[PDB]
Design a binder for this molecule. Sequence first.
Ligand SMILES: O/N=C/c1nc(CCCCCN2CCOCC2)ccc1O
Ligand SMILES: O/N=C/c1nc(CCCCCN2CCOCC2)ccc1O
Ligand SMILES: *[C@@H]1O[C@H](CO)[C@@H](O)[C@H](O)[C@H]1NC(C)=O
Ligand SMILES: *[C@@H]1O[C@H](CO)[C@@H](O)[C@H](O)[C@H]1NC(C)=O
Ligand SMILES: *[C@@H]1O[C@H](CO)[C@@H](O)[C@H](O)[C@H]1NC(C)=O
Ligand SMILES: *[C@@H]1O[C@H](CO)[C@@H](O)[C@H](O)[C@H]1NC(C)=O
Lengths: 532, 532
Amino acid sequence: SELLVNTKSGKVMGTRVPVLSSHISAFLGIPFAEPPVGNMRFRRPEPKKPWSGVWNASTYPNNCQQYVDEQFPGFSGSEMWNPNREMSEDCLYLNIWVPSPRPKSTTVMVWIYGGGFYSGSSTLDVYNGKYLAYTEEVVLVSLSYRVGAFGFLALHGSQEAPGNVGLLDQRMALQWVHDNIQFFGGDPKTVTIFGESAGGASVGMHILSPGSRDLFRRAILQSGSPNCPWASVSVAEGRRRAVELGRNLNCNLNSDEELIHCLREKKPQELIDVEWNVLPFDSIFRFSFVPVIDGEFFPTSLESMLNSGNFKKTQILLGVNKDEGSFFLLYGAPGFSKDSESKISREDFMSGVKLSVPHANDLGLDAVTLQYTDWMDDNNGIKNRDGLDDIVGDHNVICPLMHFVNKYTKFGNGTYLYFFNHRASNLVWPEWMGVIHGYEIEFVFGLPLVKELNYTAEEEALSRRIMHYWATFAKTGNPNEPHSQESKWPLFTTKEQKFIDLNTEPMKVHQRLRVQMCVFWNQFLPKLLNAT
Amino acid sequence: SELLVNTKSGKVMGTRVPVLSSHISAFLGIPFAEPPVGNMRFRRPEPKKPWSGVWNASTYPNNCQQYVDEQFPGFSGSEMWNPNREMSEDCLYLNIWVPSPRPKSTTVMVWIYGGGFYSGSSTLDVYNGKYLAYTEEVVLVSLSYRVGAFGFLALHGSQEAPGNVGLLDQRMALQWVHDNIQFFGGDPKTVTIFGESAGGASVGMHILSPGSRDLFRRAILQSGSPNCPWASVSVAEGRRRAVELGRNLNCNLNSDEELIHCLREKKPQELIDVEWNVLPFDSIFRFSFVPVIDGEFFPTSLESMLNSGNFKKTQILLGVNKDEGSFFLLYGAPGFSKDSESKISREDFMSGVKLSVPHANDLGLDAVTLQYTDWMDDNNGIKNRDGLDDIVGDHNVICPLMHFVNKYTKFGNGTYLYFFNHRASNLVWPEWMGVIHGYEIEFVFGLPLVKELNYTAEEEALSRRIMHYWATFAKTGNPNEPHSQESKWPLFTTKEQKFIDLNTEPMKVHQRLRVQMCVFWNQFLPKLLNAT
Ligand SMILES: O/N=C/c1nc(CCCCCN2CCOCC2)ccc1O
Ligand SMILES: O/N=C/c1nc(CCCCCN2CCOCC2)ccc1O
Ligand SMILES: *[C@@H]1O[C@H](CO)[C@@H](O)[C@H](O)[C@H]1NC(C)=O
Ligand SMILES: *[C@@H]1O[C@H](CO)[C@@H](O)[C@H](O)[C@H]1NC(C)=O
Ligand SMILES: *[C@@H]1O[C@H](CO)[C@@H](O)[C@H](O)[C@H]1NC(C)=O
Ligand SMILES: *[C@@H]1O[C@H](CO)[C@@H](O)[C@H](O)[C@H]1NC(C)=O
């Protein structure tokens, strides 16, 4: 049967799902690890013991335990990102969409969800792999991984809570795809990993980690890169936050053993209730438990790895959105509101700068403020709002990504860079937020092909274009069809630094994406902070 | 007789000079001090002993001893600024142009020449007062003062070489005008002092100095202000340079008495031969012997005087030119040449930055470089050339002046601000130098009214406009004619910060002159340097 697949771990039974007036096979909730529950909380994942019988893979699995966004109850803009399945520590599963009839050996794409390493679900409507698998005839995988303290609590030196175990969750799913996707018609030698935000940083982290490089062919990173200021902490900061967490829960803090045992006795929501209290600064775009620079998953610092070429050399496709910052200002900066234009007073602007660069001294705040203030019109509330927007996105997403892309292209085998700046016509968020963090995903997964979702015909064309860029890149290492008459997406090179816009207008090619601000964020400001 | 005038110091006999197919009276080379020669070198000026008989005031006096520009022999662009009279330490004289017939009690304007406190002459063709005196019916005075070491060698604590004596030369000329201009038909209660560059800084310094405030009514500063980074040094730096000077001349350095006596034995050219060797940095737009913050002429620091309102409160007219920096880059920065377009390589740009901010550390140089580099086009040699031009003018002229004008307007009684950006049609300097430091003077003194000098009719109109703005301001404290139908020059206020362009086009009003760069030069960079 087409819905029955024999794997090295056992048989699985999928389900036939409709898609665009056709059908494909879906294998939902396949386990790839032992449930990381009980005494295994905070530990590295173990591989799933093979099973007898037929595993029912007809339904979506549980989502991992996470903080849940209640800032706008009933509002689809925020709740479409919340878990849409019961939460459970028993959450290490993956999902596969397979073209029908079953392919023999086809291109594989593995989706890694974002969410600041504190949240995320493989089961969201916007991650439904059936449109991409059907349209582009790829085998689409989405994995899952522990977030929050459950995935990233780091007590370096301990083997019970070493840190990075959510990254190892991802790697074990990658190992499982490598070992088993051939049975689903996937080609294990042509696996592209792709992800957005924390998932894009994750993709970059598997590019860097020697233990991960061999498990995939090429990589796509959307609005995230491994060197992002929020994506990792040192071993000392990870230890400090773990101890502060136990301090929030009245834990014996005498030893790692005491602390871990206390934290393992707590119910999941107890950890989530206090998770945000361990941040060291009054900040935005900073998350409590994230990957740790441990000398094991990451052999040395990220910057020295990037400088020495210590990373997998292959092709990469990556990009950013126009207004990456607006989401985080909405949720955490004074003066921003969902239902107003959020014109920003000068006081509020200064408050925003401080939340945005929480590690900066007062001279650093001044440097940032000078760089982003039109002093001919300092009380322009729209310029203050857009200026804060740019600060948050430049510092947290665009300029770290530009630093990564420039270090990587020196040693890599091909780079394609995009600037996604289409505001969707059916967007439920306010105008001022612009082209929001995460809102290219629905185009990458082909949601505008579904008529009931109220996109324009031009947006369907843009989605089909992006889906084909991405799958063609996954298949060949080049998003362009050979001998095609459509406009070509030029390679990004050290010399020319070309990129394209992604929108409903005819493709335009630019160079040196936001280079003025990224020189400030990547060269000048770190020098200023290190000297003062 | 109209050419004979009885003053408190004695009688003087002027000469009738032609001007624009008419005639006026000129009284040239009137002494206002004792010759500061011999044992008086470096000392405060003494007042001139009154004389018997009639002083022959028919000819221009000697110019003070100064370094002479030989960088372009025979080239009128540079030599029109050189002394055009024999040099002598016997040089403390002033010149008066008087309308004919002699007025009874008219507006007086006193010109103070520029030249970095190391050079300058009252006798230059471009300072000929006859056009302004004739056209606007003012009594035009030009004074002189010691420059170089002769005017500004500073051994604080010594009464033989206290410093600032060139400023006291200026003040004694002002005292003489106050005491005697009534006899020439001048009104001593309506004296405007005006000057360019070091002379504009000089004007600002008499505004600040309590010993000078009472000797004039109002003030005009052109491309110079008292707080300029080159216009003054501390008492310790003045002492260091004085000692280094004696070290260059094999002087006994055991005591101030030893040092001063040695320096007084030297011929003037011996001092001039080594004057440039005492600068502490590899710099441009820095001069060896300048005013010193002595606690006497200047009671406290300039910044605290400006903050507390400790200065004469009156009306001021001031402005800058578009390309103040190009002169100094031509003479001292690598890659700039009189006869090429001076397109500037990146290496040369970096060299220029270091010469321009010689007191900056490497982080400060980076801040400057970032502020003035278009990183989308970093190898644009024209952008590097114009960028260096702007750095030099912003840092040395425009932004210090903007700092002065903003501090002053808080306490003053009326400010008028101009941006002079007309390139003269007969300019002999290359195109790349633009609207050069000092090249508004010829318009202020009415040279375009002389047909043989090859200006356009529009330039004659601009000169007449500027002459009338200036004389009307000198007469009333407002450059605008009351109940006039011509376009009005708005007051500069703390709130609106309006200024005008001065060129051959219809007047345009702008606000916040070069405010973006001046926030960098006046707020951020000093903070950066003081913290690092
Ligand atoms: O990948 N997306 C993650 C993402 N994260 C945010 C930050 C929301 C964090 C809210 C934290 N608060 C802190 C105080 O306690 C309650 C929760 C905002 C937009 C985003 O897209
Ligand atoms: O007020 N004008 C003064 C002014 N000053 C300069 C600087 C020229 C200084 C040349 C100094 N050098 C230094 C080395 O020895 C020879 C002389 C350039 C343009 C100007 O307008
Ligand atoms: C698999 O699970 C679904 C939902 O729980 C159920 O409808 C279906 O019959 C199951 N298939 C089996 C048990 O073979
Ligand atoms: C990738 O590597 C191959 C050799 O393995 C080389 O021929 C090709 O030019 C490389 N492409 C890029 C874009 O570096
Ligand atoms: C004044 O000096 C000039 C030039 O030296 C001379 O021509 C003139 O006759 C003199 N007048 C006198 C001495 O009365
Ligand atoms: C100048 O001072 C007078 C009072 O002496 C005042 O009435 C006038 O408004 C002032 N002008 C300005 C521009 O401050």
